[PDB]
Every structure is written in C-alpha cells, then in structure tokens.
Ligand binder design. Structure first.
Ligand SMILES: *Cc1cc2c(cc1C)nc1c(=O)[nH]c(=O)nc-1n2C[C@H](O)[C@H](O)[C@H](O)COP(=O)(O)OP(=O)(O)OC[C@H]1O[C@@H](n2cnc3c(N)ncnc32)[C@H](O)[C@@H]1O
Ligand SMILES: *Cc1cc2c(cc1C)nc1c(=O)[nH]c(=O)nc-1n2C[C@H](O)[C@H](O)[C@H](O)COP(=O)(O)OP(=O)(O)OC[C@H]1O[C@@H](n2cnc3c(N)ncnc32)[C@H](O)[C@@H]1O
Ligand SMILES: [Mg+2]
Lengths: 447, 448
C-alpha cells in the first residue's frame, strides 16, 4: 500500500480518508474491535451513552463540518434550572448560575485571573509553544505557582482549580504554565473551554459520537479498515516501512501513527526513534478521568426547578451536567472524577464510585439521588489502548526541551493525534485537524 | 518452565536472580542486549577500561562495597588533588584547591544554608513512602526550582547548586518535584553524600571497571540461566503463573521479576493490562538525559600545571569534569557529562561535533594543551533503546503522592525491582542491589 495509518480514532480515520480521496491506497490498523478510540458509544435504557467525548461547541469548525457532511444531528446541552454550589462542611447554595454563589469581589478576581492567563496564551505560538518570547520562564513554572502569584482568595483559587481539573484531567501543579497557556490559546480562551452556551459543552450529537466515527469509516473502501489488529512493530528503510502485527505483516511507502503519545512510544520502532522524541513521549503523560452517567427513571431535579449542575470544589467530583436526551427519559446526571480523585476512584469498584457520586448528589440535588436506577462509568486510565483521557499534558521543562520533536516526521513515519493539533488540541476537532495535516504531509512527500 | 523469570541483567536483575538460585529455586534471566551490566558498561580502548556507564562508589554504599570485596574487584581512589577551575558566564576562570574556595564568605554560607534547608525537608520524608511526609501534598505540588527561588540566594549560589542538581539528577530543578529531590537526598544521607568526591558518592573507582563486576555476578548463576539478545515483548499471567513472550516463543514461570527501567517496563505487553495507577506511574517516571564522555590524552598533562582536572561551569554545555586517568598513570583521561537540556541538544549532534564542544570548554578552563587530544569516546544513554536515559527516573510535581504508592506493589504474580524502587541510594548501583535482594525475598515468601 501507499500509506498505513495506525489507529482508527478521528485523527487516524480523517488521515485515511483524505489519503483515499486524493487517489492513494491506504490501510487503517486498529487495536480495538471498533472505531472511535477516545469516543465510545453504547446503547443503554433506550438511549446513547457517550463513555468518551460527547460535546461540540462554537469555534470547532472541522467536527461541525464532519457531523453536517455525514448527516448527524446535534442537540443543546440543557442550560435552565438552579445550579447548586457546595464549599467544605457548609450547606448547599441554590443560584440560577454557579457564578451567583460568589461575592462581587470573588467574581471580579476570577474573571481577572482568567483574563490574565489569556494574556499569556495570546503570546504562545500554536505551532511552536517553545518559541513564545517568555518560553524559558513559562516552561519552568507550574500553573499552581502562577495562580499563587495572583494573590487570589482561597475560594477563587478553589473555583479556578475545579475548572483546571475539568479541562485537563490533572491539577494546576502537574501542568507547566506554558502548556496551560498554549491549550487556552488553542481553544480561543478560558470561556471557550469552560462555558456551555458559547463554549466547548454547548452541543451533543443525537445517537452519540461513536456513530460519526463509523460513518467516517464507511467512506473507506471495503478491506481498508483492519479491526482487532494492534500494531506491535514499525520498521523503516530508505525504500518504505514494514508494519508487524500479530498474525500478519503490512508493507507501505509511509506511515501515519495516530495513537496517544504514550502508546506511540510503546511500538517497536526500527531504527529506534531519535532520543528527543522517545524522551518527549516519556514527558507527555495522559490525564486521569473516570466519566460517569447516573441513571434515574426521570430527571426529577427539573421538577424541583434544578438544572442538575452541582459544583463542589472540595468534593471528589468537580462539576455535574444534566445528560437527559431530547425525549426526556431516562434522566441522566453526567460527571467526572478528575486528576487525583480519578486515580483514587479507579483503584475502587464500580459500586464504591457509585456510592461516592450518589453521596455528593444527595447532599446537593436532594436525598432522592440515592434512588438510582443504574450507574455507568469508564476509567480511561484502565483502557489499555488509551491509558488516560482527555489527552497528554506536559510538566515543567518538557515543551522547550523535548517539545520541538512533537510533529517532526522520522523518515517515513508521520505523526497525527489531537495532541499534534494547533487549534482545539485535546478535542475531536483537534484530532480532525491533525488527520488533515498528516495526510497533506504524506501526499506532498510521496510524489 | 522455571520457578522465577527475571527481566533485565543489570545489578538489580542479577542480584535478585542470585538470591533466588541460592534459595534453591530455578531462575531464567532475560536480557535484550548481548551483554550484562545495563546502565553499567565498560569497553577496552588504549589498553585501559572505558566505563561508559556507572563507575563510582563511596561511603555508606555498603551493598556494592561488599559485592566488590566478595567477587574480588579492587577499588582505586578518584584523584582529589590540584586546583579546581570554576567559571560563571562571561567571567575569568578561577583556580582554587577546592570549588568552595572560589566563593565569597557570604556565598558559601548561603550555599550551605541552602543544602541544610533542603536536608531538613529530606529528614521528614519517609524513605519507604515519600507520600507519608506530614507536608507531602504541598512538597509534591512544588518544583525544586520554585523552592530555591524562595530561599532567595545569590545567582552564583543558585547556579552552583543547579550545576550540582544536574550532576545528580540529569535534569533541571524545574523538572523535579521538591518532594522527589528531598526523598533522593534522604536516601543518600545528604547533599555531601551526593556531591562530595571523598567521604561521598565520587570517592572510589573499580579496578578493571564496573561491567566486569556484573560479569562476575552473572558467572555465579547456573549454566543456561542467562539468555542475552532475548528482549521480553509480552507478559501474560493467569491462575497458575506467568507466560513470557519473546520473539522466539514462550517461557512459563510461577512468578516474574521485571527489573528494567520504569519507562521500558510500561512498553511490555501486559496481560491482563496493568492496573491504572501503575501504568500511569510509569508515564510519570521519565528517565534523565545524559551524554557521558572520556577525552583521551597520552598523559595527564594537567597534573604538571597543579590542576585536579575538574572544571565547574554553570553556563557551559559541560557541567562537571573529573580526572579519569587509571592508576597506571596513562593515558590521561578527562571524564565529564552533558546533563539535562545540554544532553538533549548534544544528543541530536554527531560524535565529532560533541567532541569539538568539550575541547572548546576544556581549552578555556584547563588550557591550550587540552586541544592536543588523542581520542574522544562518548555514549548518549537517551539514545540506548534498552535504557532511554541515565542516570534514572525523576518524578514531576504530583507524581509521588498520587501514583507513587504503586511503585513496589506486586501485580498478581509479577514483582518489581531496579534502583528506582530502592529506599537507600536510589538511582545508584548500591540501590539496584537493595531492590534485587528485596524483590527476591518477596517472591520466595510468595512462592513458599
Ligand atoms: C476520554 C475522553 C475524551 C474526551 C472527553 C471525555 C473523555 C472521558 N470529552 C470530549 C468532548 O466532549 N469533546 C471533545 O471534542 N473531546 C473530548 N475528549 C477528547 C477527545 O475524545 C479526543 O481528543 C479525540 O477522540 C482524539 O482522537 P484521536 O484520533 O487523536 O485519538 P484516539 O481517539 O485515541 O485514537 C487512537 C486509536 O489508536 C488505537 N491504538 C492505540 N494503540 C494502537 C496500536 N498499537 N495499534 C493500533 N491501534 C492502536 C486506539 O484503539 C484508537 O482507536
Ligand atoms: C547510565 C549511567 C548510570 C550511572 C552513572 C552514569 C551513567 C552514564 N554514574 C553512576 C555512578 O558513578 N555510580 C552509580 O552507582 N550509578 C551511576 N549511574 C546509575 C547506575 O548505572 C544505575 O543506578 C544502575 O545501573 C541501575 O541499574 P538496574 O540494575 O536498576 O538496571 P539497569 O542497569 O538499567 O539494567 C536493566 C536491564 O534490563 C534490560 N532490559 C530492558 N528492557 C528489557 C526488556 N524488555 N527485555 C529484556 N531486558 C530488558 C536492559 O538492557 C538492562 O540490561
Ligand atoms: Mg447553565
């Protein structure tokens, strides 16, 4: 074949397609028995359950183009109802929006802390974070260190910490300031990452995200997609690339590897990857998230005038969301254990995580939250073919020293994945970008 | 079929393989390279021994010290005598009988109070469970770099400290959680233990070099125990034991000890897949970045000039140098390293280019005689596919308190060794030895 793509996520599949329609031969070798990767949809209780990525919002041009091209309808994330905020061994507070549980002072400082991180972000080149003028200072500094500088009160530092852990699936301490700043630039600012209406959590897909990936996969000729076919090894010479699977061997001119960084370095590369790139991947840890859907017979919180959104900065769950489909049943409360609370939850059983979620909801939405019909969750850290969501972060010292290896081809081996995107890195939209860019590269470099 | 399969023929893998055989259980050691030693590696050049890998032992290192004397490898002192050369930025190189004496009264105070103030953090950091320090949460949330900045020392002081940090950790004070650095320091017995060249980790060398001593540990295994050029690709456990997949078939065991660097450990195909906290721990244990060099001269000409052969350069690509001349007294060798970002830059250049860079430093520090070079030999340990960086792993902020607890936890019938798992002299040969003895006991107790 002309091109072998490793991975049938949105990055893999988008690269495989652009290569196919250009007039070139391609195989996609995928480890799982399905497509979609970090997107994954299961039917439960008469509706779709997005165990992985579910949300699209404005500014995400490429996924909105894909959904529309392939005949997939969207519905809004519900917005109406009183939100509940809970601090410490305090009582729960009902407001028409989270924001209105904080003082005048507290809100000011919050929006000024966001406005401040955006200032840094705007100066970070999306294609080359290492080339910001303040790159030295910013890559030696954690986000936590920077927040502590702002001299913001504990309750505004707590609120900002819930938003950090909900966006990166890692604490402010794990991230370089330069990584955080690049990610905010990439998304078009803090409100773009955090908001529902006008934000990344604005819209969902009717029937869920995994079907959109399947529709993209059906644009490939029969025999192009190989499922349950993990790539163990990747060899290359001046003539082409030999892909060793278990029970088979594939031979192409060039390769696109579209897996999560930590899985990319697990492949037996021959010759061995250059050291800057091998060490970049040792410095690109995946985040830590357990995503859950609490299932009730009905969205009983709405009848109390409640949105179903709780925000508890001291609880092991950060933010919740009404995940009820457009038909109005079953009622769903969707949420996440993020960073350290996700690692602790992952070490426990399904039933122990259910009891923690239901306890928090009972003390916020109401005691009726213990009357659960079903609980459905996924630890993406446990998934051998992801090993953490939503994607990689870089700790201090990674971006300026190993980061330049991010996108550079090694010979005939090219790189895709949301982690290689300029815009909405970390999101489906970013995956799509990476696919388009990796394919353009291989068409150019081939003929 | 055997009782135990050890992955890695380094000092941790062999030390464990030894204590398993000595207990009367069958063992097979599987090693990806055509040799033993691992991060220790010695070659014959110019009629002497060239340690590309680990080389030094010193006081407190009671394991390696006793393994040496047992298998009969004699030691020789690292030379201490002659002026050291210190050099900051744009300034004039300073000769002093020791590095310290090139600093003001005021500077050396600030430096010593800096090391004291770190050692007092180190003292409350449990060697067995760093995550159980009273203030573990706060210390894990801080870099080494952030904490130094908070002590408020002068720059020369912070840069001299930085030189030392990178000579120990092979990574910047920004890459390291303070908690990780404090544990590393407690594990050694202090900053003097780590940085001194006498009463410290750089006091003594091994006659014939280090790979040999691991060859003498290998030779005390049964015939057929060791398969070199046998990399482990896959490890499958069920109720009755583990199945170790290589390229050339399978090897059934009751229990496995994996004794490879933590980054190499994670790349193995585990079945079932490893528990999340463990897999993600490995994701958070990156190896350091180090290129180690030896500059061959016909004679140690520098002893003529009343010079040690040690240069200390905070602002050059070359960190710390050491007189590497064998006791025979020829050839002259200047031993040194590129550390951290300097290792990664140098790593992407050729051997010839890295040679020019070191000679250019040496000539402006030791003198013009440094150009009359016989030969240059170096090794990029980041570039080795069965190491992927020396000296060992570091942990960034948040790693130790959240993922740390999985570090020694056995996973069904698979157990963990390597210097990264030692409580004492973690990151050294002596800590590999400890991890081997420890891993062995666990597996013997669990067999019977
Ligand atoms: C996990 C997650 C992600 C997510 C999120 C919530 C969770 C819990 N919410 C999101 C959302 O609402 N909106 C959004 O846009 N993104 C959200 N994220 C992240 C998003 O899902 C991802 O950024 C996107 O899916 C990334 O796609 P990409 O194509 O870059 O990566 P992938 O999905 O991991 O695909 C990799 C494929 O590679 C296969 N694999 C792995 N190793 C191998 C080998 N050795 N051989 C062959 N195939 C391999 C995987 O199985 C996978 O299919
Ligand atoms: C690299 C280095 C190390 C070193 C140092 C300078 C350099 C450049 N200076 C030191 C010094 O003066 N004194 C000292 O005590 N240590 C020094 N360091 C550190 C030292 O070398 C290490 O702490 C020590 O070597 C630790 O080794 P350990 O026994 O824990 O294991 P290893 O040496 O890394 O070897 C592991 C072996 O496993 C093999 N391997 C890897 N993957 C596989 C697979 N998949 N299958 C089979 N075998 C595998 C490796 O090839 C290696 O042999
Ligand atoms: Mg709302």
């Amino acid at each position: 074949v002309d091109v072998v793509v490793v991975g049938a996520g949105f990055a893999g599949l988008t690269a495989a397609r652009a290569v196919h329609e250009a007039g070139r031969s391609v195989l996609v070798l995928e480890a799982r028995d399905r497509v979609g990767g970090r997107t994954c949809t299961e039917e439960h209780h008469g509706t779709w359950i997005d165990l992985g990525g579910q949300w699209i919002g404005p500014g995400q041009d490429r996924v909105a183009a894909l959904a529309a091209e392939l005949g997939v309808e969207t519905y809004p994330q519900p917005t109406e109802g009183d939100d509940v905020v809970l601090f410490g061994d305090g009582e729960p507070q009902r407001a028409p929006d989270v924001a209105l549980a904080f003082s005048d002072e507290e809100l000011t400082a919050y929006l000024e802390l966001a406005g401040a991180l955006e200032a840094i972000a705007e100066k970070v080149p999306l294609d080359a974070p290492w080339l910001a003028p303040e790159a030295a200072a910013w890559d030696a500094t954690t986000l936590r260190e920077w927040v502590a500088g702002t001299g913001v009160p504990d309750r505004v530092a707590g609120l900002f910490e819930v938003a950090v852990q909900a966006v990166f699936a890692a604490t402010s301490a794990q991230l370089s300031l330069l990584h955080a700043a690049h990610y905010v630039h990439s998304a078009g600012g803090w409100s773009k990452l955090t908001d529902t209406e006008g934000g990344a959590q604005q819209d969902r897909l009717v029937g869920g995200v995994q079907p959109l990936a399947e529709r993209l996969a059906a644009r490939l000729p029969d025999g192009a997609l190989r499922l349950s076919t993990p790539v163990r090894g990747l060899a290359q010479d001046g003539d082409g690339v030999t892909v060793r699977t278990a029970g088979g061997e594939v031979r192409a001119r060039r390769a696109i590897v579209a897996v999560p960084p930590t899985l990319a370095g697990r492949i037996d590369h021959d010759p061995p990857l250059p050291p800057q790139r091998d060490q970049l991947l040792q410095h690109m840890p995946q985040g830590s998230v357990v995503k859950f859907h609490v299932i009730y017979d009905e969205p009983w919180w709405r009848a109390e005038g409640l949105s179903g959104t709780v925000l508890c900065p001291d609880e092991p769950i950060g933010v919740t969301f009404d995940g009820t489909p457009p038909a109005g049943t079953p009622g769903i409360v969707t949420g996440f254990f993020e960073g350290p609370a996700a690692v602790a939850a992952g070490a426990r059983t399904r039933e122990e995580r259910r009891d923690v979620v239901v306890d928090v909801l009972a003390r916020t939405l109401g005691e009726r939250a213990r009357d659960v019909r079903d609980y459905i969750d996924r630890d993406w850290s446990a998934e051998p073919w992801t090993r953490g969501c939503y994607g990689a972060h870089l700790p201090p010292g990674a971006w300026t020293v190993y980061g330049p290896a991010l996108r550079v081809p090694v010979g005939r081996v090219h790189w895709a994945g949301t982690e290689t995107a300029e815009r909405w890195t970390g999101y489906i939209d970013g995956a799509i970008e990476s696919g388009q860019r990796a394919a353009a590269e291989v068409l150019a470099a081939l003929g």
